Write a protein that binds this ligand. Structure first.
Ligand SMILES: [Mg+2]
Ligand SMILES: [Mg+2]
Ligand SMILES: [Mg+2]
Ligand SMILES: [Mg+2]
Ligand SMILES: [Mg+2]
Ligand SMILES: [Mg+2]
Ligand SMILES: [Mg+2]
Lengths: 287, 110, 132, 97, 87, 250
């Protein structure tokens, strides 16, 4: 270009000609001149000038401000609280629009992370992704999304457009493998079973209205219809829809990945899957 | 026994008959007898550009610099590029031959 | 008897788990703009001297920025061509709304244009019409 | 003061020796080599500070971690004292609190 | 000058000699053995049967699971009693 | 037969590819034998010399380790006993004959231990530096594109004479696709010549190009560099270290 044309005329670029970007660096002030020498910015003789003033929060000897306020349990149990990285429907639709999520295939935490739709940190107590009601109106997509937590209104958007929404619990060990599958296969260890939710979460994931994976299949129809009446839409017939098998697809409660059973081993180098023939191990894994 | 040819000069003066050479070269390259609006013809075709520019370089003795190769979109650009002269005389050489006043004397130590 | 049995039929389920290292090219849609709001660059390309390229995520490179906690600015980043023409066009576009010529900076080396205040929504649509 | 009464010998540097000519090659081994090796792996230096940087107190503790059990008695004693001096400086002294 | 050949990470499976006393201990644990299989598959040489837990190892995992992770029915049964007590 | 090369990847419609004169080292007068089309986003990026500065300094500092060291006042041998009483002698007060104020004492604030200057710039930043350096050589007519490095004879004299005939700079950097396949004739000639330094494709660096006046690139190496650098843009952020298996990455 025109700017590129100027470079042609100018002398050859070399190691001598190198220059830092304007104002990128600062002058480092040293103590050798009158303004910055002598007392060297430390004032007169005293404790702060000897370099030995007290610690932070020390207010001269009176009871400090931070120690004189009652202890309260704002942050108690913080390290064991459950975190769900929320997902809104604007982000979901936006991701589907740009081809970073495949709506035709079933959706799960692995395919959200693969398309960089969501960022998950298992080490920071993340237990999955919670769907959020923001963006329901703009949502006009039919997709089978699995998310650990769901909401009433978020369910309506998925169902109204003719989609399947399910909620499943992944324990801390299961979640790490789900977000990051490949390395687990590199470790060489067999795939583990997925533990059931602890007592606190048992009511939620067994509840029909929450679309829990362990919930009774028979009660789903009624729960969907009641929600359909509430939000003023007519239930679509998924069975008639051509992709009924895909939408209806649901992984086993003890499965981390749809198509892989617990106890198998994946050999990427040889492009093979190894399954144990031992009866004892099969008993344990089948459980 | 590869013998290096004598070094060539890097100064080029446009020939007066440059137009005759260019029009003849275009006719030879494509054999269309110089269709009207010949200058407007683009050099998008890779083979076309190579045959034209390379042929002119052999005869004229100057070749388009790689930096200026991309901007030779049309024949007119190629024609303009050859027209401008190229001088190897350093700015000092101009001073030496500038016929400076007698009180000014210059001696070259290099 | 071997302790393991190997089956290659099910290995396809692991190819599904492999993630991509590239941002997929957006899929063609019948009707634009998409429900989210995304609209692809217009065809044919604009004939203006300056071209504003899209980000690797296929979005218009207009960002709200802030410094010192109260200096609100909006910056165009992937500008190409003659940036000065873009400044003049933006100055005319934003002057009637504010009632004054906006204060702007042109970073020729970085190829960016900076505008005081937040005008992300207005500029995004304005750039959309031109087809950049 | 006093200054030399003769010029020191000329210092001649050969800028086209093998080490200088090939300086920098393979610095992009990772991005151009399918990220097989990180460029930090090409640094030649002490085991405890290959591909790492820190202040002296951190440097002192890091030297101990890697070769604390293979050090001489006097060197280890001096290192321990050097750590304790730095700890009280960086954690109890200085202009800012 | 011609530069030296580009630096390369050693390919193939890697097995240290257990005799050497300076060989890092973590490079000798059974966990490190499985890593070799995953990286290079069969060419590692790891007995594929060894990857799965051994019967004594299997009892270790099974014993722990019962202790800390109860069955679905037990969780539901206890929850009902707690509600009854609160009710 | 004009040797014509075109970009294998998709160029942006608005941008127009840059072009170069393919050359052959086989003959003295074989100046031009083919034409090439170089991807604009690699060989025509905006000219910015701060990035060249950023990478050039990086190629200097991260490797750096300094071994300068000075003993402190505690590590200096002796100096345990107090030289003399505070008062009664008419001399200043000292607590050790090894202090910073004493000849033979320990240095006050000197270099301590080995120091490291290790830092890495972002992946895109260093890749961008390579793109910038490539254009600078091209525009300044310092980059010559060659099909293959084959030479008629291994004699070093031929290579030096050829450079003067073709007006190349004194120092020439030669880049081949892979170290193993490089012709034997070039290997002998370049090794004997200090200024002509031969490196493989993967070893390209900004500092080398800045030190060397002209740069000779083989056609396959240009394609190799074009793919590597242009991958850096249009890519996601790594979920993993890249060396691990990826769906679409070699
Ligand atoms: Mg300082
Ligand atoms: Mg008191
Ligand atoms: Mg997070
Ligand atoms: Mg002492
Ligand atoms: Mg004493
Ligand atoms: Mg004392
Ligand atoms: Mg001393």
């Amino acid at each position: 270009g025109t700017s590129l044309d100027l470079l042609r005329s100018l002398p050859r670029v070399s190691l001598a000609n190198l220059k830092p970007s304007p104002n990128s660096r600062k002058r480092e002030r040293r103590p050798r001149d009158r303004r910055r020498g002598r007392k060297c910015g430390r004032g007169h003789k005293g404790e702060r000038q000897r370099g030995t003033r007290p610690r932070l929060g020390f207010e001269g000897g009176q009871t400090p401000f931070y120690i004189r306020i009652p202890k309260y349990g704002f942050n108690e149990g913080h390290s064991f609280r459950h975190q769900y990285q929320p997902l809104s429907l604007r982000r979901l639709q936006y991701l589907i629009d740009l081809g970073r999520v495949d709506p035709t295939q079933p959706i799960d935490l692995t395919q959200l992370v693969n398309g960089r739709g969501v960022t998950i940190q298992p080490l920071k107590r993340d237990y999955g992704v919670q769907l959020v009601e923001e963006g329901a109106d703009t949502f006009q997509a039919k997709i089978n999304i699995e998310v650990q937590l769901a909401s009433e209104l978020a369910i309506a958007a998925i169902e109204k457009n003719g989609g399947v929404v399910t909620t499943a619990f992944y324990d801390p060990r299961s979640l790490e493998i789900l977000c990051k599958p490949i390395p687990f296969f590199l470790r060489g260890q067999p795939i583990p079973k997925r533990m059931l939710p602890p007592e606190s979460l048992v009511p939620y994931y067994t509840d029909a209205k929450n679309r829990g994976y362990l919930a009774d299949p028979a009660k789903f129809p009624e729960a969907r219809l009641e929600l359909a009446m509430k939000f003023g839409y007519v239930l679509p017939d998924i069975t008639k829809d051509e992709l009924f098998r895909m939408l209806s697809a649901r992984k086993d409660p003890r499965q981390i990945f749809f198509g892989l059973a617990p106890g198998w081993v994946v050999n990427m180098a040889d492009k093979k899957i190894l399954k144990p023939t031992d009866e004892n191990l099969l008993k344990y894994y089948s459980s | 026994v590869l013998v290096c040819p004598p070094l060539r000069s890097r100064a080029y003066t446009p020939p007066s008959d440059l137009q005759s050479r260019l029009e003849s070269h275009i006719k030879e390259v494509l054999g269309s007898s110089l269709p009207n609006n010949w200058q407007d013809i683009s050099l998008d075709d890779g083979h076309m550009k190579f045959r034209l520019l390379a042929g002119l370089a052999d005869g004229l003795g100057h070749a388009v610099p790689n930096s200026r190769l991309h901007q030779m979109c049309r024949v007119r650009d190629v024609l303009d590029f050859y027209n401008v002269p190229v001088q190897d005389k350093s700015k000092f050489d101009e001073l030496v031959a500038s016929n400076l006043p007698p009180n000014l004397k210059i001696s070259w130590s290099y | 008897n071997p302790g393991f049995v190997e089956s290659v039929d099910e290995y396809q389920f692991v190819e599904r788990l492999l993630p991509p290292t590239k941002i997929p090219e957006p899929p063609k849609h019948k009707h634009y703009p998409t429900p989210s709001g995304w609209q692809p660059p217009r065809d044919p390309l604009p004939s203006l001297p300056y071209f504003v390229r899209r980000s690797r995520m296929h979005n218009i490179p207009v960002y709200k920025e802030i410094t010192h906690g109260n200096r609100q600015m909006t910056l165009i980043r992937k500008v190409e061509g003659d940036i000065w023409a873009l400044q003049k066009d933006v100055e005319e576009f934003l002057s009637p709304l504010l009632g004054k010529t906006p204060i702007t900076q042109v970073n020729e080396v970085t190829g960016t244009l900076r505008i005081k205040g937040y005008f992300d929504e207005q500029l995004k649509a304005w750039l959309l019409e031109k087809g950049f | 003061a006093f200054v030399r009464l003769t010029l020191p010998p000329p210092k001649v540097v050969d800028r086209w020796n093998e080490k200088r000519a090939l300086f920098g090659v393979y610095d992009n081994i990772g991005i151009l080599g399918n990220f097989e090796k990180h460029p930090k792996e090409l640094i030649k230096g002490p085991v405890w500070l290959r591909g790492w940087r820190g202040n002296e107190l951190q440097r002192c503790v890091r030297k101990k971690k890697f070769v604390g059990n293979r050090m001489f008695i006097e060197d280890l004693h001096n290192l321990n004292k050097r750590i304790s001096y730095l700890y009280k400086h960086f954690n109890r002294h200085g202009k800012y609190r | 000058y011609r530069a030296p050949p580009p630096p390369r990470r050693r390919p193939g499976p890697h097995s240290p000699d257990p005799e050497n006393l300076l060989t890092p201990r973590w490079q000798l644990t059974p966990r490190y053995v499985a890593k070799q299989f995953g990286r290079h598959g069969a060419i590692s040489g790891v007995p594929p049967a060894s990857l799965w837990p051994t019967p004594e190892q299997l009892r270790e995992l099974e014993a722990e699971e019962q202790e800390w992770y109860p069955s679905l029915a037990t969780m539901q049964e206890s929850l009902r009693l707690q509600q009854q007590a609160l009710e | 037969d004009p040797v014509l090369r075109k970009c294998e990847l998709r160029i942006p419609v608005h941008r127009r590819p840059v072009q170069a004169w393919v050359e052959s080292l086989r003959g003295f007068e074989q100046e031009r034998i083919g034409l090439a089309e170089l991807h604009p986003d690699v060989f025509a990026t905006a000219p910015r010399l701060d990035i060249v500065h950023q990478v050039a300094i990086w190629q200097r500092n991260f490797r750096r380790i300094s071994y300068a060291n000075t003993k402190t006042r505690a590590e200096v041998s002796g100096g345990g006993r107090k030289p003399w009483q505070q008062k009664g002698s008419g001399r200043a007060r000292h607590g050790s004959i090894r202090s910073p104020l004493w000849r033979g004492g320990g240095v006050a604030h000197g270099p301590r231990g080995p120091t490291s200057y290790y830092y890495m710039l972002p992946m895109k930043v260093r890749a961008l530096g390579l793109k910038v350096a490539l254009t600078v050589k091209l525009m300044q007519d310092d980059l010559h594109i060659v099909d293959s490095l084959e030479l008629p004879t291994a004699d070093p004299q031929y290579l030096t004479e050829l450079a003067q005939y073709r007006h190349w700079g004194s120092s020439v950097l030669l880049v081949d696709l892979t170290h193993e396949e490089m012709p034997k004739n070039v290997v002998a000639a370049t090794s004997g010549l200090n200024s002509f330094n031969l490196i493989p494709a993967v070893g390209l660096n900004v500092y080398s190009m800045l030190k060397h006046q002209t740069l000779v690139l083989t056609l396959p190496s240009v394609a190799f560099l074009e793919d590597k650098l242009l991958w850096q843009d249009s890519r996601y952020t790594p979920l993993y270290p890249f060396r691990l298996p990826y769906s679409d990455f070699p």
